[PDB]
């Protein structure tokens, strides 16, 4: 039903309209590509204002009605699990393949035939990346070169001031939760938190789970060396409901009667801690003044008002379980850790709970200090792709020199392989070469230099001067050959940029119609 007022777009004009809608997204993000890329202003629906150049964050905040424009956004969820940095470079590359495809549609070439040309030329570019790739950690596991690589990725963000200290933390964090030989690193085991105040140089590496909550009483012991952890959903006191107790006291007769029953419940549960051998008691709610009075005499520190999701994160990291009631307590459900401390921040009353294992563990949490919440939020994303860079080096240590040296070297091989295909797909291979040149071209344009004179100059150097690929300096450094500048991106990332961009172009060309009913 609802056939009237149904938006329909079909024919050859439908493909040119889809490309135009796709170029609107590519032309928007191509200015933010690279470390010198301009920022974007974000106005939230609630009135908040934030400024970031991160491409994955922009695509999440862009609200686009057009269907093909929505497909470009769904690609970010797939790439962020791998690269998380050059995600913008894929959207720019996807827009270049479609922009050059518009010239081919005027010649009468079928769209499926064009998509076959990109797939054929993609395998040539991927194969060329394997020959020019060099290794680092091959056959020898070392942390010295691994730290220097992460120092460059953080240079493109606002954390570029403290960038050197945060590199050693991400290295020891990934190696702790997983071994490089295992080549399996889960992002769910790594958490990142932060709080306003301090500086980015105060970032520390704590092995365990950390949440911001205070102790039940300030005089409780601040250091627990032995590992005993009681994690319950109920506080230690006479049982109280989850909302409001509302005790009914008619007169002093009911006061003295119920107080004795409460007094029996006061000493019962507090002394129950020592019966199970537990030391630290983690309860979802707080304690009364009488409950904390018995803990000081028995030296039993505890944490109050623990959040709902915080209970699950503590039991997993410390190796404990969630205990609904004190009747099920046992020795196996106790959590373990090396040290428990309470570290405050300046004069602030936060006093975040610190759980330290005093050894290696399978989960770590990085905490960040800073004077602005927006800078800390961008510092969280600064470590996100940094963990991916380290993870990619663990999976495959072969790397290809970035800064545009990779994309330019591939088009030289693809352009030569084009004359070996006596068929109409030859044009698609030539258009695929000019599309790879766009990513290194947008780097020079964002640096305030002539794009064309910089691109053609590097081409002559790779063909004549030296066979190894040479890059473009967008930071206004001494000269080219980023190998000395130590700007390097992983090989796995280079293979995904070409593979994911080919998927998007192939899906957009094969869709000749978009249907949807209107408001009746």
């Amino acid at each position: 039903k609802d056939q009237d007022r149904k938006s329909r777009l079909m024919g050859l004009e439908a493909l040119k309209s889809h490309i135009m809608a796709a170029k609107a997204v590519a032309n928007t993000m191509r200015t933010s590509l690279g470390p010198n890329g301009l920022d974007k202003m974000m106005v939230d629906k609630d009135g908040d204002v934030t400024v970031t150049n991160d491409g994955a964050t922009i695509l999440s905040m862009m609200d686009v009605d057009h269907q093909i424009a929505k497909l470009m956004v769904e690609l970010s969820k797939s790439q962020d699990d791998e690269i998380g940095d050059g995600t913008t470079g894929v959207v720019v590359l996807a827009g270049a393949l479609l922009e050059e495809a518009e010239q081919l549609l005027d010649r009468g070439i079928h769209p499926i035939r064009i998509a076959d040309g990109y797939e054929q030329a993609a395998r040539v570019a991927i194969e060329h990346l394997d020959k020019i790739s060099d290794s680092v950690l091959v056959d020898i596991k070392d942390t010295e070169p691994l730290i220097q690589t992460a120092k460059t990725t953080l240079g493109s963000k606002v954390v570029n001031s403290c960038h050197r200290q945060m590199a050693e933390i991400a290295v020891n964090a990934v190696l702790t939760v997983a071994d490089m030989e295992r080549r399996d690193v889960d992002f769910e085991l790594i958490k990142v938190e932060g709080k306003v105040g301090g500086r980015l140089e105060d970032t520390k590496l704590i092995k365990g789970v950390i949440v911001d909550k205070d102790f039940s009483h300030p005089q409780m012991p601040k250091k627990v060396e032995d590992a005993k952890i009681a994690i319950l959903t109920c506080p230690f006191e006479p049982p109280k409901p989850k909302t409001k107790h509302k005790l009914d006291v008619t007169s002093v007769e009911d006061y003295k009667a119920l107080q004795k029953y409460e007094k029996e419940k006061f000493e019962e549960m507090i002394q129950q801690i020592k019966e199970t051998g537990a030391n630290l008691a983690i309860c979802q709610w707080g304690f009364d003044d009488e409950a904390n009075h018995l803990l000081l005499q028995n030296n039993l520190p505890a944490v109050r008002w623990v959040g709902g999701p915080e209970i699950e994160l503590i039991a997993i990291a410390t190796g404990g379980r969630i205990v609904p009631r004190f009747s099920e307590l046992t020795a196996e459900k106790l959590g373990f850790a090396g040290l428990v401390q309470e570290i405050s921040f300046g004069t602030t009353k936060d006093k975040m709970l610190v759980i330290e294992q005093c050894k290696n563990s399978r989960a770590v949490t990085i905490f960040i200090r800073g004077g602005n919440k927006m800078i800390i939020e961008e510092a969280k994303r600064s470590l996100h792709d940094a963990l991916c860079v380290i993870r990619n080096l663990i999976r495959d240590n072969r790397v290809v020199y970035g800064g545009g040296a990779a994309e330019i070297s591939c088009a030289l091989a693809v352009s030569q392989e084009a004359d070996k295909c006596p068929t109409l797909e030859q044009y698609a291979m030539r258009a695929f070469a000019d599309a790879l040149e766009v990513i290194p071209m947008a780097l020079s344009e964002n640096s305030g230099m002539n794009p064309i004179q910089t691109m053609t100059e590097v081409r002559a150097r790779q063909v004549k001067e030296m066979n190894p690929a040479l890059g473009i300096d967008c930071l206004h450094k001494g000269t080219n050959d980023m190998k000395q500048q130590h700007v390097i991106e992983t090989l796995i990332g280079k293979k995904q940029q070409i593979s994911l961009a080919t998927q998007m172009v192939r899906m957009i060309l094969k869709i000749d119609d978009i249907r949807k009913p209107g408001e009746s």
């Binding site: 004359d419 006596p422 030859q426 044009y427 004179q453 053609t456 081409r459 002559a460 063909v463 004549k464």
Partner: protein, 107 residues
């Protein structure tokens, strides 16, 4: 058009795109002869670029038989002065047009 593409790769600066555009504009002559001969203009030019890469100038378009065959065997030949004067005179006109910023009427 095939050899100027290789020379465009060895050069540097703006001459890379300018010479390449001059080479791609040379394919309009064979694309027109294939259209009047009842063939596919896009597919015929593609096959000739491969035959000229591996082979020699012999490959071409035969309008009498309506297909790609040996031009020398079909008794089709033209003197060299016609092709040389075609590139020289056309270039001087294109360069003259690009040098004109504005026209002014006098009296």
């Amino acid at each position: 058009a095939l050899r100027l593409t290789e020379y465009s790769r060895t050069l540097s600066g703006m001459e890379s795109y300018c010479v390449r555009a001059f080479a791609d504009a040379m394919e309009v002559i064979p694309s027109t002869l294939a259209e009047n001969a009842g063939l596919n203009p896009i597919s015929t030019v593609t096959e000739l670029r491969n035959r000229h890469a591996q082979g020699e100038k012999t490959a071409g378009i035969n309008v009498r038989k309506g297909g790609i065959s040996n031009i020398l065997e079909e008794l089709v030949v033209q003197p060299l002065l016609v092709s040389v004067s075609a590139l020289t005179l056309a270039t001087e006109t294109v360069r003259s047009i690009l040098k004109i910023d504005d026209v002014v009427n006098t009296r």
